[model samples]
Structures are given as structure tokens and as C-alpha cells.
Target: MADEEKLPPGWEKRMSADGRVYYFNHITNASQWERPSGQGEPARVRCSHLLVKHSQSRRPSSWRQEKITRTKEEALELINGYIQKIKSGEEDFESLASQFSDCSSAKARGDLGAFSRGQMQKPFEDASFALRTGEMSGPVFTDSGIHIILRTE
Candidate 1:
């Protein structure tokens, strides 16, 4: 399709490497990138996180369900300990996450399965995407709380 061809409302078109036309929906956050008709498997990434939620929040009820409670400084200290253990091979990421992470993904050994960009919170996304495979990063703070992220894929 020509680059100048008009698209329907709320839609935008872009060119692929071989000059193929692709459209995306900004409103619904869907796109050809999800899985083009003739394209193969879509790009996806897998990761895990160990979150430590703070006790205080703008909405009182919002943070009540959190299982782990700690100040930011405390969370950092604890996470650092886990990182050290992982670096020395004294501990594993999944086990530590299952023991300490406040997020529900901890049940599956912190496995986040597969995801693309824009799916996670900005801070988490930036940290997760920047890692090389098998690298772990954290004490990363987001609205939900502190996180230790491992890029498994």
C-alpha cells in the first residue's frame, strides 16, 4: 500500500523492512506486530520479578492485600542480600522470589511468561528491557513498590 493512502479513524500505518504496509490501533493497543497474517511467531520476552510493596499508599485499601511490608530502605537491603546470594550461587532467583516477592507471579517462581513493551509499568519496563538475557536487576522502585527483575529470555 502507498504511504500516502488514507487510513480509517484512529488507525496509523507504517512500513516494514521489505516495505510492507502494517497498521496498528492506538486506542486498543493492538497491532500487526501481535502476529501478522503471513508472519511467523511474534516477538515476546520472558522475565520474573520479586516485588516488595510499601505499606502506605494514596488509596488505603489498595495496598492492604500486600503480604510483604517494608520501608524502601529495608526492601533495598533485603533485595541486595538476595542479589549477593544469587551472584555467589548460594541461592536461585526463582526460589528467592517465591519466598520474598510480594507480587502474585512469585507463585510460578516469578515467571512472567512472555510479554512485549508497554505491558509493564514504565520503571519496570525500562529496567526489564535493558537487561541482557539471564541478567538480574533491581531494587527498582515503582508505584507498587520495590522489584528485583531477572530477564530469563
Candidate 2:
């Protein structure tokens, strides 16, 4: 097993917008490898803990992350804006995702495919999952930002 390896610390179940269920894992430090089309999609892995041998490559130390001020009014307004967009089928999902989502998934098309309960932030999960497919909800505030959520049924 010395040469064999696994990656992306935890494995768990998550629901997708399309309502499909699957196991999703987060890999912290495993070699980025790809398999040819005939071989398979890619090699999947599981590990108890992700190795952080390359954490130094993450970002500029001087980059100042944005901070937001939260209040009931702020939260509600943000949520309403999102709802409006969804009702119009005009939610700029990727743009809002890049600007608003705090998790890594934001980078990949705001594709928060599905996360088990408690995996996502509490306020986010509560507001996000509460809405029906066409419904948008939030203005709920959390460490991330005031959220505006639209689930896909």
C-alpha cells in the first residue's frame, strides 16, 4: 500500500439539483491525474485526511478577502433580488456564484450540485433548501454573505 494513495478526505452523500443522489468527495492533496476516455472518467479516491503539502501555492498572502455587513434589511433585499432573477429565469447563476458563494464550488459554475445536511452552512442550507424549484429564498445572513437561493426542484 506504500505506493497506492487516496485523496479528498471525506466521503458522503449529497442530493443534486436534478434530484439524483451520489457520493461526493473533497480531495485536498492528491496528484491531479486523468484517465484516457477508454480507461474511465477518472480515478476516484478516498482518504481519511487530505495532505496539505502544497498549501503554500494557494494564494497571495496580501490578498484582502472581501467582508460584508449583515442586517435584516440587507439580507432580505439580497434574497429578494435573487428571487426576482429566478422568477424571470434570469438568475446569473455563475456570476452570482462567483461573487457570492464562499465555497470552492463557486468557481465551477456555482455548481453546488448537492450537499448532505449540515455540510453546507446552516443559514445557507436552511434558506436554500426551503424554496421550491422556481422559488427563490434568502437574504439570510451567515459568515459567507446574505444569500439569495433558488433550488432546481
Candidate with the greatest TM-score versus the true structure: 1
- In candidate 2, residue 115 scores what lDDT? 51
On residues 108-152, what C-alpha lDDT tens digit does candidate 2 reach at each position?
544555554566657655544433344333344554444444454
Point out where model 1 deviates above 4 Å.
1-43, 57-69
Per-prediction TM-score, please? 0.63, 0.39
lDDT for 9 in candidate 1 is 34
Q: Which lDDT value does model 2 have at 12? A: 40
Off by over 4 Å in 2: 1-91, 98-103
Residue by residue across 1-153, what tens digits does model 1's lDDT show?
345545433346767787777765343222343222212222566889877666552221222253444566776687778877887799998998887777778788889887888898877776666554775674677787777888888
- Candidate 2, residue 49: Cα displacement in angstroms equals 27
What global local distance difference test value does model 2 have? 0.40
